[PDB]
Write a protein that binds this DNA or RNA. Structure first.
Ligand code: AGS
Ligand code: AGS
Ligand code: ADP
Ligand code: MG
Ligand code: MG
Lengths: 282, 292, 327, 161, 338, 103, 330
DNA sequence: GATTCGTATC
């Protein structure tokens, strides 16, 4: 039960941004989060158990040092922590470099309920100001960890859409297309449309209809695909799309929707998957 | 279609429709369509009414094929209309092109937005389908700049202001005073506008006939601040606000917010009723505090 | 497009002189209007008596053209909670008149469905802003209103429509629609109306639809009974005679034959027999009790449903057992 | 505050007549007081309606514009000796006058709650019968037959068996 | 496990206690495309559920018994979590109103809306437990979604089922077997597992002590077999449910002592029975019938007892608190017997 | 009477009349107590939990759908007896569900 | 394919049988556009839903129906809020413009219809809110209320809505429809059959059609190619055989409590419904001429009380035993 | 409102 890690944001930008995006997403989704510290990767899980699940994979090479030892299988240390305290710590550490610094963030598991000793340094202008934090966490049991599993997705009718990268010419237009439905206050369900490439956002109600359509170029990696989902999950999808260049959208006919985000670190690639159940039936 | 119009200046439409946000958040909005343009008339509890005037010159594809009637009236919701005109038309290279459409009775009010990359069609079903001051009995007339009136209204809002008062008194020495006395948790609150011509450009007090300019007498207006705050967002974009009130207790606000070179701004007309003021001794305290 | 409307919402009176039946109330409110003083009116009566039509015509007469802004009408279809009463009603009855002077009119249609807190808040608005605003309350059940609200409101009782008002309205409808009505059908229609004009209008529309060719064809009592599915008086008299005089088997046969001849319902026969037996002279006072009680539970059981033949046999047995007390 | 007496109501009413100078009759003033039932506002409203609708205030005009209080009619109906008189009163005074059956049942319950010169067992039996009738009215069966049956059962329990 | 499910006939041809009902089920399963909604009514423990499962196997093939137990969450008009268990299987759904009370309308509404979207058969055990609102939704749900769903509900004493539902279903009756058929089934069971079985008369005793209940008879047989050291005796006592013994003791106390203190003791016994989650309607039924087997009561007393039983079970059906009606029935019996 | 005020009035009036008619001087009354219905509800909740456990173990180790009605009638007493001899002569639930029924 | 009840559902107003008055009124409403608010009430399985669906089909056609009809039943929430927002908004909506095909092939009335099926399950507050909703928007929206119990509809709504009672479908009413269905489905029956079916199916065509379908399925399973007899019909309808009823009457005649109790236990062991046997006993006792007037009155009241108790979802065994004991002491 | 036990006062 000896967990210790060191994070340096300035040394490696992309994976630190991935970690910050994962923390922001799990904080925005719901309170508390599951941190599974496997010996070769760290998985951050937000399980509400209709509401979606976020399964982000963070390789061990992301952090400068990843000593993980426990009596469980493959040194699996599973912990539940409040995202708000971790989010506040990460905001402080982000402002530490924003004011100008390159100090590392040391995290140790100092003692079932434990706490992480997230301590880092900051220099104003040549002064030493030690920032010490202790976030109370609970230690999930081994069987309780086994009760949490990533939901597999069937491929019988599931169809992939390769959304354009946001760094490209069409990326800003596609981001505007995604957020075009967010400017309506009285929207709770978005009914997607894909026929076999077009992505259509349809919001049909008693006395008003909406027909947002994407006329730009799109790719499907390698038939109608309709699923109606809540608007709050679509906000999370839009937030994830902006922070990831490689974004893959999977739509299942009246079953589910999958928002796949991948960060090409090559090296093991960091991936974020947001499984979303249909709010209601077609 | 019986009516069609296309525009590229969606920010102006967005602000004009957001001027109606102080009114009912999710209620009905009634639209006239004629050759001069289209108008949005909104009323609340039969005590206050707002009205927009979007001229034809503002649009660049105004057609109005209708010939059976001089005007076409349709009643729809306002919130989804605001969200539709809330595109903000970013990415200046590719301007969003709106297209309002209506095909007579039984047809939805279509709002087509084209970005050459994103196509959005919004349809609104129509529903089944007054406060005017007489232009002969005006008690007072004032022309106030929009910024000062907006600041006064915001300060009144920030101090509660359950009730509000309007003071308008002219003097023989060409001195004019205009103040907003308010009832709130604080007690007696006043906000007197400057007598300079930069803000109080004109202030004329009449004898209830709109002709004789009488001096030394004050016009009192007792208005519920829930109705008064409806004009706060209208005065935010106003360049000059025109104030008029007759003896019948009706307050009319003429918002003059002076993009196409031919259209004469957006005309916003707000008409508001005056409280009964059963207590006759309240006005006595108003004038006593005004004299000091 | 008044020809595209149901007859109930086609002959709604537009003026006070077009409202029949409640002559006293109409004369009183007309005297109120001519004198220039109108109290806080309260209209009470059974449905279809003409309360909404009367108050709407009164408001139109008072405000000929300013009806839109001088009248605030709220009913059960709109929310009338504590917040609506606190805000909207106060704002309407707190501002001055636009240019019509007089007073502001607030109509509370079906005020019996309002909550007690709403009425408690409304009583102070009524008694506070009465200088420039008058309230009208329409209700069919007075037990659902606060006693204070009844205290501050002048109560007007809308009686069920008498015969002559029904005759006059039916004559106007016949003149408008170019229809003919037999006097026997006229008597049948008024009896089934039960002091309701809406029922009369609906039955007249159904009878006009029943005729193969509306013109040159009179509406007889047979047409009325066929359209509305009600038993004829002769059928009721025959059934009562068979129950009272004949034995059990033939009385059951007569009831079954009468019911199966036209598909009549047992509840309609029960109501007809109750109406006929009320005119009977019973000298025991126990037959009355037995009849009323047994027929009441039988009617209640029919309302909850069950075996129809068992209920008919129960009716026959109840009548026979009750009339066995007269010896 | 107790209920206003007839004398005080009469004094205030007479003050209002003297201030307004309208024609009145002593029988009419007595009828106004009787209809008011100790309510001063109701008396003023009834008097104003009578003056504005008919002018001279007599018993005829007052009883032609305003109605007798239905609690008293219900109390008279419940205290009838034989069933025929009670049935006739109920019909001709509540059913032909346009009173809802639920109103009649609630008024009967209140009257029985405030009914004197009756035995406790009789009072509770009539309360139970009124409650059963109230349940039947609430469930949907609101016909005149239910009220007639309630009166019949009340008379049966009154005269025993 | 227990012998009740050990010898449960899985197939249609394995049902050998009704014969005519088996032929009728074969007639229904000949062409499943035109199969209407079915309602099975009969005595408890007859085997109606076994017939339904055998019919489903005859239609959809073996595999209907591959039950997966799932957990479902529902929300009423207000914010509330309803943890309803669902025992679904290929082309088969199971719903029971036992766990859910007055909230039984929204759960069946959501479940049938989701399942209804060939057809999928839905089984509703204990159809009498619905509160006349789930029935109101169900009538339209089955009338409009008859193409993609079929409803087969089992029940006993179908009187509390509303008329439109009974009109929308095929009425199938499942009579309880005779004592000889129960004895034959028990003989087959004891042939499959030898139990000595000294005399054939004890099988008839078990059959007569169950009143035509297969489950109760099998439970009795297993209980005697396990208690008598894997054997059986001609003089072995008849084992009966504990609440039956308690109700019999209550009847004996009522017959012997008739007083207010005895009334309070009877109230305590009824409270214990209610706390043991035994429904009050069958408590009244068993108490009434145990009173009628008392040999010291004349015909007038028995008639008064049955009349009070009818009045008070109607009152309990139209009531809210069950203790009032049970106490009233016991007090009326005491005041009639004295 | 579905909680009508007439029901409460009639019940209280009948109780008071009954106790007034039989009232006599020198009576020695007893001590009143709160109703025990909440204890019965708690016992029913415990029985519900135990029956849910029985139905879960009966639907996990094998496939057998039994109704809660049958659990309360027969399986609450017969099945513990089966599990008793089966175990002592040699499943999880061995005691009578909700405890034994006394008197 | 489909069950015969849904397969033979009427498509036009002509296919609806025995309800001549309402069908004629709706047919004349087709040639006009002054259709009032309708209140369809009657026994179950009398064709109210079929009639309203046929009228809806004829008025607008398959295309305009989706835009001009709103249907709410007991399977969806119909609270006071639902009535105050959804129904009011739909009634306030402007009538959709018909197409050229719709205006050339269908009458296309200038109003729309809101159908509230199973209106007996609606609370009084919802109906109170519905009152002015129908009254105000009568010229742009029409209302149809379908129920089985008239008393569950409040008096103002019954006043506003036109009443259309649906007659119970007896043997003479629906014998033509049953014969047509049997001929179209190739069903062979003896003389007097389908008449016993309509007699057992008292005021219900759905039950009679289901019984005919079940009898046809049984005959097809038998494969002998023989006509269906009335005996088989009574058996699958749940009708107690006459021998059992005769034994019941004989045991009731001898007023022994023990024999009656034992026979009632044996009878309820057979799963017979108490309602059917009570109806059969009522028919036997009222029809028979061996009893006098007083006995017939008492038996009628006892059977009425037993039927009312059974309709309240009580115990069948206790009610049947009490009824038979009361008969034995008559 | 009732019972049961303990004090203060007449
Ligand atoms: N006295 C009357 N004279 C003429 N038509 C009448 C009269 N009373 C009722 N009617 C007709 O019946 C229709 C319904 O009556 P309304 O006055 O609108 O309802 P109401 O009488 O207020 O009953 P409630 O209590 O509101 S359900 C009117 O539109 C008229 O067509
Ligand atoms: N007059 C009729 N003509 C033809 N078929 C009819 C008639 N009445 C009923 N049916 C048949 O009865 C079955 C059900 O009819 P529905 O109209 O849905 O029942 P219902 O009248 O709504 O009774 P409910 O729903 O219990 S209130 C269908 O198969 C119809 O074909
Ligand atoms: N034909 C049969 N042969 C043998 N056992 C049967 C037969 N029918 C039913 N059973 C037994 O009845 C038991 C349960 O019956 P069940 O289906 O629960 O009756 P119900 O449906 O009335 O509740 C099963 O365990 C099964 O062994
Ligand atoms: Mg009205
Ligand atoms: Mg129907």
């Amino acid at each position: 039960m000896k967990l210790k890690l060191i994070v340096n944001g300035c040394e490696a930008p992309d994976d630190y941004k991935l970690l910050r995006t994962t923390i922001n997403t799990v904080a925005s989704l719901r309170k508390t989060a599951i941190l599974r510290f496997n010996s070769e990767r760290l998985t951050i899980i937000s399980t509400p158990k209709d509401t979606g699940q976020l399964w982000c994979t963070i390789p061990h090479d992301v952090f400068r040092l990843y000593t993980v030892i426990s009596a469980r299988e493959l040194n699996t240390i599973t912990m539940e922590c409040n995202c708000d305290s971790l989010l506040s710590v990460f905001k402080r550490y982000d402002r530490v470099m924003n004011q100008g610094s390159s100090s590392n963030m040391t995290i140790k598991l100092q003692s079932p309920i434990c706490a992480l000793g997230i301590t880092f340094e900051e220099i104003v202008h040549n002064k030493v100001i030690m920032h010490s934090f202790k976030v109370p966490v609970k230690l999930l049991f081994r069987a309780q960890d086994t009760r949490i599993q990533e939901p597999m997705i069937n491929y019988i009718q599931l169809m992939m859409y390769k959304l354009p990268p946001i760094s490209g010419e069409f990326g800003s237009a596609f981001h505007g297309f995604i957020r075009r439905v967010e400017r309506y206050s009285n929207v709770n369900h978005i009914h997607l449309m894909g026929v076999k490439v077009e992505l259509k956002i349809i919001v049909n109600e008693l006395d008003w209809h909406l027909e947002i359509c994407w006329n730009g170029p799109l790719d499907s990696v390698i038939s109608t695909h309709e699923v109606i989902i809540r608007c709050k999950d679509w906000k999370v999808c839009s937030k994830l799309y902006a922070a990831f260049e490689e974004v893959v959208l999977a739509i299942s006919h009246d079953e589910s929707c999958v928002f796949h985000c991948s960060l090409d670190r090559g090296r093991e690639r960091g991936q974020i998957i947001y499984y979303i159940a249909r709010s209601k039936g077609l | 279609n019986k009516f069609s119009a296309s525009t590229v200046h969606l920010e102006h439409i967005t602000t004009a429709l957001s001027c109606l946000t102080p009114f009912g958040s999710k209620d009905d909005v009634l639209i006239f369509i004629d050759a001069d343009g289209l108008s949005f008339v909104r009323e609340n509890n039969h005590v206050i009414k707002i009205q927009l005037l979007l001229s034809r010159e503002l649009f660049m594809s105004y057609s109005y094929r209708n010939e059976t009637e001089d005007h076409m009236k349709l009643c729809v919701k306002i919130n989804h209309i605001l969200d539709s005109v809330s595109v903000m038309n970013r990415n200046s290279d590719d301007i969003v092109e709106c297209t309002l459409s209506y095909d007579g009775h039984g047809s939805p009010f279509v709002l087509i937005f084209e970005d050459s990359f994103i196509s959005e069609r919004v349809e609104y079903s129509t529903y089944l389908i007054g406060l005017e001051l007489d232009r002969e009995r005006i008690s007072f007339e004032a022309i106030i700049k929009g910024e000062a009136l907006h600041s006064a209204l915001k300060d009144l809002k920030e101090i509660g202001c359950k009730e509000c008062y309007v003071y308008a008194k002219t003097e023989a020495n060409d001195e004019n005073v205009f103040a907003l006395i308010s009832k709130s948790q604080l007690g007696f609150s006043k906000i007197k506008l400057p007598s300079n011509r930069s803000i109080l450009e004109k202030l004329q007090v009449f004898d209830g006939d709109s002709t004789t300019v009488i001096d030394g007498f004050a016009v009192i207006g007792f208005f519920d601040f829930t109705s008064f705050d409806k004009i706060r967002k209208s005065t935010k974009i106003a360049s000059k606000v025109l104030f008029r009130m007759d003896v019948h207790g009706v307050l009319s606000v003429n918002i003059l917010s002076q993009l196409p070179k031919d259209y004469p701004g957006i005309v916003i007309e707000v008409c508001m009723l005056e409280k009964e003021s059963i207590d006759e001794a309240a006005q006595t305290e108003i004038e006593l505090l005004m004299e000091t | 497009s008044k020809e595209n409307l149901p007859w109930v919402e086609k002959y709604r009176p537009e003026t006070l002189d077009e409202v029949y039946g409640q002559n006293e109330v109409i004369t009183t409110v007309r005297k109120f209007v001519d004198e220039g003083k109108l109290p806080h009116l309260l209209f009470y009566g059974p449905p279809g008596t003409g309360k909404t039509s009367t108050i709407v015509a009164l408001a139109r007469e008072i405000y000929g053209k300013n009806y839109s802004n001088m009248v605030l009408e709220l009913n059960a279809s709109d929310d009338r909670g504590i917040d609506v009463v606190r805000n909207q009603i106060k704002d309407f009855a707190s501002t001055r008149q636009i240019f019509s002077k007089g007073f502001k009119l607030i109509i509370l249609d079906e005020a019996d469905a309002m909550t007690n807190a709403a009425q408690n808040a409304l009583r102070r608005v009524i008694e506070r802003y009465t200088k420039n605003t008058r309230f009208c309350v329409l209700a069919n059940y007075a037990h659902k209103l606060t006693p204070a609200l009844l205290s501050r409101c002048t109560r007007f009782r809308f009686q069920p429509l008498p015969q002559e008002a029904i005759e006059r309205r039916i004559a106007n409808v016949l003149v408008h629609e170019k229809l003919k009505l037999s006097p026997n059908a006229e008597k049948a229609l008024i009896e089934l109306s039960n002091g309701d004009m809406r029922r009369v209008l609906n039955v007249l529309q159904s009878c006009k639809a029943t005729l193969d060719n509306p013109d040159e064809d009179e509406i007889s009592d047979d047409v009325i009974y066929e359209c509305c599915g009600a038993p004829r008086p002769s059928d009721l008299k025959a059934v009562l005679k068979s129950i009272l005089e004949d034995d059990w088997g033939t009385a059951h046969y007569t009831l079954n034959k009468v019911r199966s001849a036209k598909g009549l319902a047992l509840i309609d026969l029960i109501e007809g027999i109750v109406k006929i037996l009320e005119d009977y002279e019973l000298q025991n006072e126990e037959t009355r009790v037995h009849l009323l009680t047994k027929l009441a539970d039988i009617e209640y059981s029919i309302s909850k449903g069950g075996n129809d033949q068992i209920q008919g046999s129960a009716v026959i047995g109840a009548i026979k057992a009750s009339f066995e007390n007269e010896t | 505050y107790s209920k206003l007496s007839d004398e005080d109501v009469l004094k205030r009413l007479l003050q209002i007549i003297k201030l307004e100078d309208v024609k009145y009759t002593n029988d009419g003033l007595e009828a106004i007081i009787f209809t008011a039932e100790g309510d001063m506002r109701q008396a003023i409203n009834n008097l104003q309606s009578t003056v504005a609708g008919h002018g001279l205030v007599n018993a005829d005009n007052v009883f032609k514009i305003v109605d007798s209080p239905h609690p008293l009619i219900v109390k008279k109906m419940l205290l009838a000796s034989n069933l025929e008189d009670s049935i006739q009163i109920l019909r001709t005074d509540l059913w032909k006058k346009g009173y809802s059956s639920i109103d009649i049942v609630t008024t009967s319950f209140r009257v029985t709650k405030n009914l004197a010169q009756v035995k406790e067992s009789v009072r509770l039996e009539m309360i139970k019968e009124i409650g059963l009738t109230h349940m039947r009215i609430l469930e949907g069966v609101g016909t005149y037959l239910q009220l007639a049956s309630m009166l019949a059962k009340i008379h049966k329990l009154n005269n025993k068996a | 496990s227990l012998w009740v499910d050990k010898y449960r006939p899985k197939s249609l041809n394995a049902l050998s206690h009704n014969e005519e009902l088996t032929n009728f089920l074969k007639s229904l399963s000949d062409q499943p495309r035109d199969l209407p909604h079915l309602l099975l009514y009969g005595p408890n423990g007859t085997g109606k559920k076994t017939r339904c499962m055998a019919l489903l196997e005859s239609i959809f093939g073996p595999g209907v018994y591959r039950l997966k137990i799932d957990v479902r969450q529902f929300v009423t008009a207000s914010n509330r979590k309803l943890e309803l268990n669902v025992v679904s299987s290929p082309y088969h759904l199971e719903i029971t109103p036992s766990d859910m009370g007055n909230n039984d309308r929204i759960v069946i509404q959501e479940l049938l809306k989701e399942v209804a979207q060939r057809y999928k058969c839905v089984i509703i055990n204990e159809a009498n437990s619905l509160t006349k609102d789930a029935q109101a939704a169900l009538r339209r749900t089955m009338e409009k979604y008859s193409k993609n769903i079929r409803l087969i509900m089992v029940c006993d004493s179908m009187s509390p089922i509303i008329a439109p539902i009974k009109s929308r279903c095929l009425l199938i009756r499942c009579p309880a077997p005779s004592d000889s058929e129960i004895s034959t089934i028990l003989s087959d069971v004891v042939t499959n597992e030898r139990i000595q079985l000294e005399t054939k008369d004890i099988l008839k005793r078990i059959a007569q002590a169950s009143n035509g209940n297969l489950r109760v008879s099998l439970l009795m047989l297993e209980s005697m077999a396990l208690n008598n050291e894997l054997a059986l005796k001609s003089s072995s006592p008849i084992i009966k449910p504990d609440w039956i013994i308690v109700i019999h003791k209550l009847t004996r106390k009522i017959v012997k002592e008739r007083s207010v203190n005895s009334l309070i003791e009877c109230r305590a016994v009824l409270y214990d029975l209610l706390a043991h989650c035994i429904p009050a309607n069958i408590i009244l039924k068993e108490l009434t019938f145990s009173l009628l087997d008392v040999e010291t009561l004349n015909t007038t007393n028995k008639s008064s007892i049955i009349e009070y039983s009818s009045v008070f079970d109607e009152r309990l059906s139209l009531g809210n608190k069950a203790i009032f009606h049970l106490e009233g029935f016991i007090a009326k019996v005491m005041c009639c017997l004295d | 009477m579905n909680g009508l005020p007439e029901s409460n009035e009639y019940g209280l009036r009948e109780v008071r009349k009954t106790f007034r008619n039989i009232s006599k001087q020198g009576h020695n009354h007893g001590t009143v107590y709160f109703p025990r219905e909440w204890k019965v509800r708690k016992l029913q909740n415990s029985f519900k939990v135990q029956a849910e456990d029985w139905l879960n173990v009966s639907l996990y180790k094998y496939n057998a759908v039994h109704s809660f009605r049958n659990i309360t009638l027969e399986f609450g007493y017969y099945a513990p007896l089966i599990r008793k001899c089966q175990s002592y002569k040699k499943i999880d639930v061995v005691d009578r569900i909700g405890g034994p029924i006394e008197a | 394919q489909q069950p015969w009840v849904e397969k033979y559902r009427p498509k036009n107003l002509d296919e609806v049988t025995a309800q001549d008055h309402a069908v004629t009124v709706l047919k004349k409403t087709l040639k006009s556009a002054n259709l009032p608010h309708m209140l369809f009430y009657g026994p179950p399985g009398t064709g109210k839903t079929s009639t309203i669906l046929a009228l809806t089909k004829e008025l607008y056609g398959p295309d305009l129906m989706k835009s001009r009809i709103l249907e709410l039943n007991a399977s969806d929430e119909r609270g006071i809020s639902i009535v105050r927002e959804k129904v009011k908004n739909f009634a306030r909506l402007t009538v959709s413009k018909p197409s050229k095909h719709d205006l050339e092939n269908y009458p296309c009335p200038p109003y729309k219809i809101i159908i509230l099926d199973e209106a007996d399950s609606m609370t009084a507050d919802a109906q109170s809110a519905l009152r002015r909703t129908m009254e105000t928007y009568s010229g742009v929206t029409r209302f149809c209320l379908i129920c089985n119990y008239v008393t569950r509809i409040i008096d103002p709504l019954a006043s506003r809505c036109s009443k259309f009672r649906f007659k119970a479908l007896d043997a003479s009413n629906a014998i033509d429809r049953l014969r047509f269905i049997s001929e179209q489905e190739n069903v062979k029956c003896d003389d007097g059959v389908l008449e016993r079916i309509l007699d057992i199916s008292a005021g219900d065509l759905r039950r009679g059609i289901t019984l005919l379908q079940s009898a046809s399925k049984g005959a097809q399973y038998l494969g002998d190619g023989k006509n269906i007899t009335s005996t088989q019909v009574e058996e699958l309808a749940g009708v107690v055989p006459h021998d059992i009823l005769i034994e019941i009457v004989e045991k009731v005649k001898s007023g022994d409590f023990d024999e009656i109790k034992k026979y009632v236990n044996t009878f309820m062991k057979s799963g017979w419904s108490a309602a059917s046997v009570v109806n059969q006993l009522h028919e036997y006792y009222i029809t028979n001429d061996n009893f006098d007037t007083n006995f017939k009155n008492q038996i009628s009241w006892l059977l009425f009380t037993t039927d009312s108790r059974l309709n309240n979802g009580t115990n069948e065994h206790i009610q049947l035993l009490n009824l038979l004991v009361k008969i034995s002491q008559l």
